[PDB]
Design an enzyme around this catalytic site. Structure first.
Site, PDB file in Angstrom:
ATOM      1  N   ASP A 155       7.177  -1.578   7.614  1.00  0.00           N
ATOM      2  CA  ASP A 155       7.817  -2.645   7.179  1.00  0.00           C
ATOM      3  C   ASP A 155       9.071  -2.003   7.337  1.00  0.00           C
ATOM      4  OD1 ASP A 155       9.739  -3.680   5.161  1.00  0.00           O
ATOM      5  OD2 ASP A 155       8.196  -5.179   5.015  1.00  0.00           O
ATOM      6  N   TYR A 162       4.667  -5.202  -3.558  1.00  0.00           N
ATOM      7  CA  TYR A 162       4.464  -5.421  -2.177  1.00  0.00           C
ATOM      8  C   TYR A 162       5.347  -3.996  -1.334  1.00  0.00           C
ATOM      9  CZ  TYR A 162       5.639  -6.397   2.936  1.00  0.00           C
ATOM     10  OH  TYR A 162       5.934  -6.142   4.220  1.00  0.00           O
ATOM     11  N   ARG A 192      -2.041 -14.719  13.648  1.00  0.00           N
ATOM     12  CA  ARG A 192      -0.431 -13.885  13.673  1.00  0.00           C
ATOM     13  C   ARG A 192      -0.706 -12.493  14.480  1.00  0.00           C
ATOM     14  NH1 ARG A 192       2.910 -16.443  10.212  1.00  0.00           N
ATOM     15  NH2 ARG A 192       3.400 -14.487   9.300  1.00  0.00           N
TER      16      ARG A 192
HETATM   17  N1  LIG Z   1       5.668 -11.103   9.861  1.00  0.00           N
HETATM   18  C1  LIG Z   1       6.474 -10.168   9.445  1.00  0.00           C
HETATM   19  O1  LIG Z   1       7.566 -10.482   9.285  1.00  0.00           O
HETATM   20  C2  LIG Z   1       6.489  -8.688   8.871  1.00  0.00           C
HETATM   21  C3  LIG Z   1       7.442  -7.841   8.555  1.00  0.00           C
HETATM   22  C4  LIG Z   1       7.164  -6.630   7.968  1.00  0.00           C
HETATM   23  C5  LIG Z   1       5.798  -6.096   8.000  1.00  0.00           C
HETATM   24  N2  LIG Z   1       4.775  -6.959   8.739  1.00  0.00           N
HETATM   25  C6  LIG Z   1       3.752  -6.367   8.578  1.00  0.00           C
HETATM   26  O2  LIG Z   1       2.825  -6.742   9.774  1.00  0.00           O
HETATM   27  C7  LIG Z   1       1.222  -6.870   9.156  1.00  0.00           C
HETATM   28  C8  LIG Z   1       1.042  -8.383   9.819  1.00  0.00           C
HETATM   29  O3  LIG Z   1       1.878  -9.371   9.496  1.00  0.00           O
HETATM   30  P1  LIG Z   1       1.568 -10.924   9.291  1.00  0.00           P
HETATM   31  O4  LIG Z   1       2.632 -11.411   9.123  1.00  0.00           O
HETATM   32  O5  LIG Z   1       0.857 -11.458  10.477  1.00  0.00           O
HETATM   33  O6  LIG Z   1       0.568 -10.789   8.082  1.00  0.00           O
HETATM   34  P2  LIG Z   1       0.089 -11.819   7.211  1.00  0.00           P
HETATM   35  O7  LIG Z   1      -0.190 -13.372   8.304  1.00  0.00           O
HETATM   36  O8  LIG Z   1       0.934 -12.193   5.954  1.00  0.00           O
HETATM   37  O9  LIG Z   1      -1.328 -11.357   6.568  1.00  0.00           O
HETATM   38  C9  LIG Z   1      -2.304 -10.940   7.694  1.00  0.00           C
HETATM   39  C10 LIG Z   1      -3.746 -11.055   7.032  1.00  0.00           C
HETATM   40  O10 LIG Z   1      -3.787 -10.215   5.866  1.00  0.00           O
HETATM   41  C11 LIG Z   1      -5.029 -10.567   5.482  1.00  0.00           C
HETATM   42  N3  LIG Z   1      -5.282 -10.287   3.976  1.00  0.00           N
HETATM   43  C12 LIG Z   1      -4.484 -10.741   3.075  1.00  0.00           C
HETATM   44  N4  LIG Z   1      -4.945 -10.593   1.807  1.00  0.00           N
HETATM   45  C13 LIG Z   1      -6.148  -9.956   1.866  1.00  0.00           C
HETATM   46  C14 LIG Z   1      -7.078  -9.404   1.176  1.00  0.00           C
HETATM   47  N5  LIG Z   1      -7.083  -9.364  -0.340  1.00  0.00           N
HETATM   48  N6  LIG Z   1      -8.164  -8.782   1.745  1.00  0.00           N
HETATM   49  C15 LIG Z   1      -8.242  -8.698   3.105  1.00  0.00           C
HETATM   50  N7  LIG Z   1      -7.464  -9.383   3.891  1.00  0.00           N
HETATM   51  C16 LIG Z   1      -6.409  -9.966   3.423  1.00  0.00           C
HETATM   52  C17 LIG Z   1      -5.124 -12.139   5.772  1.00  0.00           C
HETATM   53  O11 LIG Z   1      -6.503 -12.485   6.123  1.00  0.00           O
HETATM   54  P3  LIG Z   1      -7.419 -13.928   6.220  1.00  0.00           P
HETATM   55  O12 LIG Z   1      -6.562 -14.914   6.831  1.00  0.00           O
HETATM   56  O13 LIG Z   1      -8.509 -13.715   6.654  1.00  0.00           O
HETATM   57  O14 LIG Z   1      -7.462 -14.329   4.601  1.00  0.00           O
HETATM   58  C18 LIG Z   1      -4.120 -12.433   6.495  1.00  0.00           C
HETATM   59  O15 LIG Z   1      -4.447 -13.266   7.708  1.00  0.00           O
HETATM   60  C19 LIG Z   1       1.390  -6.975   7.694  1.00  0.00           C
HETATM   61  O16 LIG Z   1       0.916  -5.635   7.431  1.00  0.00           O
HETATM   62  C20 LIG Z   1       2.696  -7.153   7.204  1.00  0.00           C
HETATM   63  O17 LIG Z   1       3.099  -6.547   6.142  1.00  0.00           O
HETATM   64  C21 LIG Z   1       5.150  -8.288   8.759  1.00  0.00           C
HETATM   65  C1  LIG Z   2      11.305  -8.059   2.560  1.00  0.00           C
HETATM   66  O1  LIG Z   2      10.829  -7.078   2.144  1.00  0.00           O
HETATM   67  C2  LIG Z   2      10.623  -8.762   3.848  1.00  0.00           C
HETATM   68  C3  LIG Z   2      11.667  -8.758   4.855  1.00  0.00           C
HETATM   69  C4  LIG Z   2      11.256  -9.067   6.120  1.00  0.00           C
HETATM   70  C5  LIG Z   2       9.893  -9.582   6.435  1.00  0.00           C
HETATM   71  C6  LIG Z   2       8.791  -9.436   5.506  1.00  0.00           C
HETATM   72  C7  LIG Z   2       7.453  -9.490   5.671  1.00  0.00           C
HETATM   73  N1  LIG Z   2       6.689  -8.735   5.362  1.00  0.00           N
HETATM   74  C8  LIG Z   2       5.355  -9.542   5.463  1.00  0.00           C
HETATM   75  N2  LIG Z   2       4.064  -9.325   5.203  1.00  0.00           N
HETATM   76  C9  LIG Z   2       2.878 -10.073   5.344  1.00  0.00           C
HETATM   77  N3  LIG Z   2       1.867  -9.360   4.922  1.00  0.00           N
HETATM   78  N4  LIG Z   2       3.425 -11.228   5.643  1.00  0.00           N
HETATM   79  C10 LIG Z   2       4.573 -11.496   6.066  1.00  0.00           C
HETATM   80  N5  LIG Z   2       4.675 -12.926   6.777  1.00  0.00           N
HETATM   81  C11 LIG Z   2       5.643 -10.676   5.955  1.00  0.00           C
HETATM   82  C12 LIG Z   2       6.970 -10.741   5.987  1.00  0.00           C
HETATM   83  C13 LIG Z   2       7.798 -11.993   6.525  1.00  0.00           C
HETATM   84  N6  LIG Z   2       8.238 -12.911   6.891  1.00  0.00           N
HETATM   85  C14 LIG Z   2       9.404  -8.863   4.300  1.00  0.00           C
END
Ligand SMILES: NC(=O)c1ccc[n+]([C@@H]2O[C@H](COP(=O)([O-])OP(=O)(O)OC[C@H]3O[C@@H](n4cnc5c(N)ncnc54)[C@H](OP(=O)(O)O)[C@@H]3O)[C@@H](O)[C@H]2O)c1
Ligand SMILES: *C(=O)c1cccc(-c2[nH]c3nc(N)nc(N)c3c2C#N)c1
Ligand SMILES: NC(=O)c1ccc[n+]([C@@H]2O[C@H](COP(=O)([O-])OP(=O)(O)OC[C@H]3O[C@@H](n4cnc5c(N)ncnc54)[C@H](OP(=O)(O)O)[C@@H]3O)[C@@H](O)[C@H]2O)c1
Ligand SMILES: NC(=O)c1ccc[n+]([C@@H]2O[C@H](COP(=O)([O-])OP(=O)(O)OC[C@H]3O[C@@H](n4cnc5c(N)ncnc54)[C@H](OP(=O)(O)O)[C@@H]3O)[C@@H](O)[C@H]2O)c1
Ligand SMILES: NC(=O)c1ccc[n+]([C@@H]2O[C@H](COP(=O)([O-])OP(=O)(O)OC[C@H]3O[C@@H](n4cnc5c(N)ncnc54)[C@H](OP(=O)(O)O)[C@@H]3O)[C@@H](O)[C@H]2O)c1
Ligand SMILES: *C(=O)c1cccc(-c2[nH]c3nc(N)nc(N)c3c2C#N)c1
Ligand SMILES: *C(=O)c1cccc(-c2[nH]c3nc(N)nc(N)c3c2C#N)c1
Ligand SMILES: *C(=O)c1cccc(-c2[nH]c3nc(N)nc(N)c3c2C#N)c1
Lengths: 251, 251, 248, 251
Positions: B144, B157, B13
């Site tokens: 975020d 979170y 991702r």
């Molecule tokens: N996706 C969104 O819409 C969104 C929105 C706002 C902010 N963000 C931020 O963007 C970043 C990447 O997002 P994402 O959706 O790609 O993240 P994600 O897939 O939810 O998590 C990314 C990785 O975090 C690692 N992780 C979880 N718990 C762990 C632990 N205890 N120790 C070490 N590693 C751990 C996992 O690794 P393993 O698979 O190796 O276990 C996972 O693949 C995150 O910081 C997230 O908060 C994302």
């Molecule tokens: C709520 O606060 C919120 C809104 C939109 C997207 C996110 C979000 N934060 C995440 N962190 C991690 N580590 N992984 C995922 N998938 C997300 C998402 C999502 N969707 C939170």
């Protein structure tokens, strides 16, 4: 019957002043403390002398650990045990000291203390407070007006206070259906550290645009009293700076 | 000589897309992972196919604990041992799940995971990164965009992500004299969780003003690339929303 | 001697509640109005029935123009004339309507930016220039970062008002003049707004799924002018029932 | 065919750096100017010498007035007339001088200039740009990283810059359905005013954590170039600070 309030770190300084004002407004108070036993029992006497059976002390370390949840449950439990109810939680207790990124407590201890006291304990207390719930229920978190203009080398403290902002907002949102408000009060410079030299203190004082002086503890408490009062019934998720304009001043 | 980057949670991702583009730009990469070994190894093999000896993996749990500091120091060390240097740290790994305030992970585990991954590990990684230090050194924290309008019942979170803003700021200030810049990228809605029904994904997508869709991992990676490049050399303490205007949309 | 307060746009709705409460707290008040002369005078009559010679009215268009400075200078003079002093200025008057990007546009600039930011700046200049517990309270907007669709100029005016709050707090601090704000989310909904569009907004509010009464907005104003807020300046208090915390 | 950009106040300093960089990226540019006719045509000559028929000048006063909408509409018209399109609008022109609240130009004139250049002209130019329209349309507003810690006695300027933040946000929201992104770039200190004494420049320079120096105009232009680029196509409503950490330094 009179409403009851828990105030963490209430034996001294701002916490005491909040306890004293809440009490003068008619609240019964749990005066939480960690090390300051003499000052806490002393405050409970002052208070109970004024109105009998209105103040208890409650000792607890608020450092992060696997028992912190139990400790926080117990602080809330203690208010119900003394007074049969818990209307107001004020999260005031806080550790405050530098944690430089680049080089006698270990760093895991520094995390536990700074993030425990400033963020995690407030989360846990907020959780127990709500689990245990005419009424005017609210929480006031003591935040920091300088969070975006932080003290140099205070990253853990600052991270704690930023987290406290997030908790203020998340909890206001989630707890609003239960009629529980969650707000903050954010001092700039108020009662300065006891350990701070007098030259440093003055250096901070002269920065404040409104009166070139720190806030009294009473001035911080006035904002608290407002937020828990009937005049703030629609206020939730608000953080009121009480900083004499300090955060408005550029480098 | 090619610079080196650490990307936490880089197996999949967003972090994978980050590690890919960094590599495409000429970085050597440490791909950190927790449980996703097979994807992490598979990414390293694809990258090493492009250029021999340019990717290594590194496994660690980033949950808060007494061993977390050593774990984070070891991740930085792994980059130095592989590549002789460490120019870029990207704090991307994150635990994410609800922690309701009212009504089988214990709460202290949730705290450890949510606040450890999102906040404390970043802080320790930053410490170890700085301690170990033409050159263009920087850190990018994955923040975020919705941090002031949080998801219901994600208070831990959210507290983590706020603490992360705090670190981003506090570290920019403190590390600027070493020439280390510290910034954030703040997605709104990017890649939705794998299991999520498309119908539920569509409720979020529909909210995004710019295109009524989520950001690709690649679009989030672009901002990271920009923040680490020579084009951002005066930028520190900045958090770039990459959110399609989602954070501007009222309820 | 009883302190005195100017409230702009005080004939109705939130401004009226702010005036009434200030009066109930013991202020003498200047009730400014533009079109609502009848409502302004009936308020003053009611206030003067409680206490003689403690309420006067003051008319002025607050639209930006060549004459606005004089108009604003005169609103302040009218408090000094009636009461010998001016302790509190409440900038409440405000034009509010959509100005889509895709009346002439120059008139919309003049009304929306004049009422919401420029007149407040000029009233602030005149208040300070003629100068105890002195403060100014600006009526801001809690949704200013999640603005209403197609309300650019209004939104620009309320952002400007935030800037004035901050700049004036900093610069008037040495005169003991505090400068703060109150930021309603949804309070009394516009009279024109359809009852169904009213209910959509009410539903969004986490704390009670209702708008703020005018009195709830005024309570915050009362706090800010009080001896209980003597260290507070450059603060904007949201009174929005959490509405601003609610994601899309 | 090559895309086209309008840059207001482009004759000198930061505006010039933006036009030059946009030009080197392959844009045709309208160089708007007010009084600096000589510098403006001189820039247009240089750029036309690199690629003929890629730069034109356009004179306009951006003071608020009843004809300002017509003037701003004609700036956009001038780009379409020279180049057949208008892809990018950079709102750079700005009046900048003090307007003390307590006691040259009348105050009406101070309002018209400071609010006009910094807020109203950009709004009108935005209306006009939108009204005229796989491409990549965007607007970049030159904001100010110090708006919340403002310069003493600059309220009208500061009000202007806050308003420009409100425009950036309101416009990003309203124009997103048209594929028009609206973002900002917020210098702290970049090129200091020509009238400033060197002693006084150094005072400001010493405040900057990242290098104790001001941003070069090129460093501001880099962030503009990023935002209009294909690497920012999900970014709208974002304001990127380029301040070297200045906004994070407390008084
Ligand atoms: N996706 C969104 O819409 C969104 C929105 C706002 C902010 N963000 C931020 O963007 C970043 C990447 O997002 P994402 O959706 O790609 O993240 P994600 O897939 O939810 O998590 C990314 C990785 O975090 C690692 N992780 C979880 N718990 C762990 C632990 N205890 N120790 C070490 N590693 C751990 C996992 O690794 P393993 O698979 O190796 O276990 C996972 O693949 C995150 O910081 C997230 O908060 C994302
Ligand atoms: C709520 O606060 C919120 C809104 C939109 C997207 C996110 C979000 N934060 C995440 N962190 C991690 N580590 N992984 C995922 N998938 C997300 C998402 C999502 N969707 C939170
Ligand atoms: N003073 C200021 O200028 C200022 C500025 C900005 C924000 N604030 C905030 O305002 C609040 C009050 O400030 P203050 O200066 O009065 O606080 P303080 O005196 O530094 O701390 C208040 C109390 O916190 C308690 N505490 C410390 N570590 C603890 C632990 N591990 N467990 C439980 N309690 C612990 C202590 O209790 P015992 O004495 O009982 O051990 C202490 O008396 C704090 O949250 C602070 O962060 C203050
Ligand atoms: N109600 C809400 O939900 C809400 C939400 C956010 C912020 N606010 C803010 O709170 C304040 C009060 O809200 P409201 O709903 O009570 O205001 P409102 O009823 O829309 O307007 C208040 C008064 O402003 C005066 N006014 C309008 N244009 C004027 C002009 N050109 N010159 C002079 N005066 C003018 C009018 O006075 P006359 O009738 O005498 O002409 C009007 O009665 C405003 O600043 C508003 O922006 C309100
Ligand atoms: N310099 C900094 O440290 C700094 C800090 C924060 C933000 N910024 C922002 O970055 C941008 C560029 O800064 P800068 O210092 O390069 O700007 P600047 O030199 O002050 O001004 C750029 C141009 O603005 C134009 N302008 C002024 N009044 C005008 C009017 N009434 N009508 C039309 N145009 C007018 C002038 O054009 P003519 O010369 O053609 O008359 C001027 O050369 C500005 O928006 C500024 O506010 C800069
Ligand atoms: C730095 O970010 C900062 C500036 C001014 C005041 C403070 C501050 N926070 C505190 N928390 C606690 N628990 N105790 C004290 N004494 C303080 C102070 C102070 N001074 C931090
Ligand atoms: C949109 O930005 C927005 C959301 C909620 C409430 C308001 C609002 N602003 C107002 N200003 C004035 N002068 N008058 C009224 N009635 C309002 C309202 C409302 N409702 C704007
Ligand atoms: C005060 O609020 C402030 C701090 C740093 C830099 C500035 C600033 N704003 C400007 N606008 C314009 N149009 N021109 C210049 N030179 C500047 C400067 C500067 N320096 C304001």
């Amino acid at each position: 019957e009179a409403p009851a309030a828990v105030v963490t770190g209430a034996a001294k300084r701002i916490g005491r002043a909040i306890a004293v004002k809440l009490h003068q407004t008619g609240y019964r108070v749990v005066i939480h403390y960690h090390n300051s036993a003499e000052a806490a029992v002393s405050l409970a006497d002052e208070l109970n002398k004024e109105r009998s059976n209105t103040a208890v002390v409650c000792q607890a370390d608020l450092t992060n650990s696997n028992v912190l949840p139990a400790s926080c449950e117990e602080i809330i439990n203690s208010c119900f045990r003394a007074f049969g109810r818990c209307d107001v939680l004020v999260n005031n207790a806080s550790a405050f000291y530098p944690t430089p990124l680049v080089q006698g407590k270990t760093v895991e201890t520094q995390v536990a203390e700074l993030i425990g006291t400033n963020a995690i304990a407030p989360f846990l207390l907020t959780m127990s407070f709500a689990q245990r719930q005419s009424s005017n229920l609210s929480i006031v978190n003591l935040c920091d007006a300088m969070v975006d203009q932080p003290c140099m080398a205070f990253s853990l403290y600052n991270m704690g206070k930023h987290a406290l902002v997030g908790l203020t907002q998340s909890a206001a949102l989630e707890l609003a259906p239960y009629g529980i408000r969650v707000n903050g009060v954010a001092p700039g410079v108020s009662l300065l550290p006891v350990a701070m030299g007098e030259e440093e203190k003055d250096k901070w004082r002269r920065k404040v645009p409104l009166g070139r002086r720190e806030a009294s503890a009473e001035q911080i408490a006035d904002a608290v009293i407002f937020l828990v009062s009937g005049s703030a019934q629609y206020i939730t998720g608000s953080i009121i700076k009480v900083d004499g304009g300090l955060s408005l001043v550029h480098a």
